A paper describes a structure:
Pseudomonas aeruginosa is a major gram-negative pathogen responsible for a variety of infections and possessing an array of both intrinsic and acquired resistance mechanisms, including β-lactamases, like the chromosomal Pseudomonas-derived cephalosporinase (PDC). β-Lactams are the most widely prescribed class of antibiotics in the United States, and antipseudomonal cephalosporins (including cefepime) are important therapies (alone or combined with β-lactamase inhibitors) for P. aeruginosa infections. Taniborbactam (formerly VNRX-5133) is a novel, investigational, bicyclic boronate β-lactamase inhibitor shown to inhibit members of all four Ambler classes of β-lactamase enzymes. PDC-88 was chosen as a representative member of the group for detailed characterization and is noted for a T289-P290 deletion (by structural alignment-based numbering of class C β-lactamases, “SANC”) in the R2-loop (ΔT289-P290). Herein, we focus our efforts on PDC-88 to better understand both the basis of this expanded-spectrum activity and its inhibition by taniborbactam.
The active sites of the PDC-3 and PDC-88 structures in complex with taniborbactam revealed strong electron density for the bicyclic boronic acid inhibitor. Taniborbactam was covalently bonded to the hydroxyl group of the PDC catalytic serine (S64 by SANC) and made extensive interactions in both the PDC-3 and PDC-88 active sites. The boron ring oxygen hydrogen bonded with the side chain of Y150. The cyclohexane ring of taniborbactam made van der Waals interactions with Y221. A minor difference between the taniborbactam binding modes in PDC-3 and PDC-88 was that residue Q120 in the latter hydrogen bonded with the amide oxygen (3.1 Å distance) of taniborbactam, whereas PDC-3 did not (distance is larger in PDC-3 at 3.6 Å). Superimposing the taniborbactam-bound PDC-3 and PDC-88 structures onto their respective apo structures indicated that binding of the inhibitor caused only minor conformational changes. For PDC-88, in addition to the Y150 change as observed for PDC-3, residue Q120 moved toward the active site to make a hydrogen bond with the amide moiety of taniborbactam. Also, upon binding of taniborbactam, L293 shifted toward the inhibitor to facilitate a 4.8 Å hydrophobic/van der Waals interaction with the bicyclic ring scaffold of taniborbactam. The similar binding mode and interactions for taniborbactam in PDC-3 and PDC-88 agree with the similar Ki app values measured for the inhibitor.
Author numbering: 5 to 360
The structure:
Amino acid sequence: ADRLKALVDAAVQPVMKANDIPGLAVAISLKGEPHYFSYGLASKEDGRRVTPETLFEIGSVSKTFTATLAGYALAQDKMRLDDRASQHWPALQGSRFDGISLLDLATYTAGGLPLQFPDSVQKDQAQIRDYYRQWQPTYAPGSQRLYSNPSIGLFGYLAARSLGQPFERLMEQQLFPALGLEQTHLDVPEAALAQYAQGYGKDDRPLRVGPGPLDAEGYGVKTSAADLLRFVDANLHPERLDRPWAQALDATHRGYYKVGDMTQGLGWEAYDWPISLKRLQAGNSMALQPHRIARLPAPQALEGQRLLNKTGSTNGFGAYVAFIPGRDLGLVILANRNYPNAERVKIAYAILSGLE
Ligand SMILES: *[B@@]1([O])OC2=C(C([O])=O)[C]=[C][C]=C2[C][C]1[N]C(=O)[C][C]1[C][C][C]([N][C][C][N])[C][C]1
């Protein structure tokens, strides 16, 4: 307990001072035991302290939840990864999505869908439909990875359509309950708002995420360190869940291609373990520009001596999740500042190394 807190303090405290992080929550799953380390302030203005129940925006860590709902649709044979995208939304039939697979959308290889929807696209069903209807690939589907909200957002929306209900309803009514997540929200209840940390940007501008097209699919989850560790433990032990949910989690542990040291799954990104900190930082700090992929001859099991991870950022928050299946080791780092991905990995690496 002294060694473990000293290890986590040594990793966290300098990174919080260097990046002026007001509050940070750590959760570690070690050999099936949870450990929580809470630092600093959820809100500077009233001095509310971070706890393991504080809600943080996890940004693009939401994509691993989106991938899990798609895994659930696969498990129920409502869809297949080699389906043409437009088979799941009649509004897209006759568009370029006639020639793009669900796997291409899930893995950012549809042919140049951008990082974000253009500002001209509001959170509006018609605007989003018309955006996709008019879109044309810049390059061949299946050839270049460009990290993209509209890409995996559409994957998530099409998975929900395949299940016959809206995305946000499936998450609240089926997925969060199935995984035992009662402190995980797309739309934070009025009664839980007291737990919602403040985000801090430039000059400590207060920042909580506003509405955007396919926000729920791309970046919309708010959760606690305790709940996000529950999600990690479900990923470490899919076999403990009812069969369809065990399968949905397994679908997110399959690699399709490599870019540098990274193997791309559905939501999760994987590295061999051990690997240098510099390489794990570089993987998580990629130039937001297109990368040629190396396609695997068959989908690869993402298990054993590998680190699976995901970064997530909003204007006010910075999240990182990592787990090593072969070591039954999981960690969550949630902060209320969008501090650099390399600094998030720096904390995590110090902890995971400390425990190897
Ligand atoms: B997501 O968090 O992944 C991501 C990272 C990362 O992996 O850490 C870094 C940089 C960008 C992204 C994209 C994802 N996050 C967002 O899209 C943030 C979101 C974008 C829309 C904003 N509101 C628009 C204003 N009308 C809010 C922040």
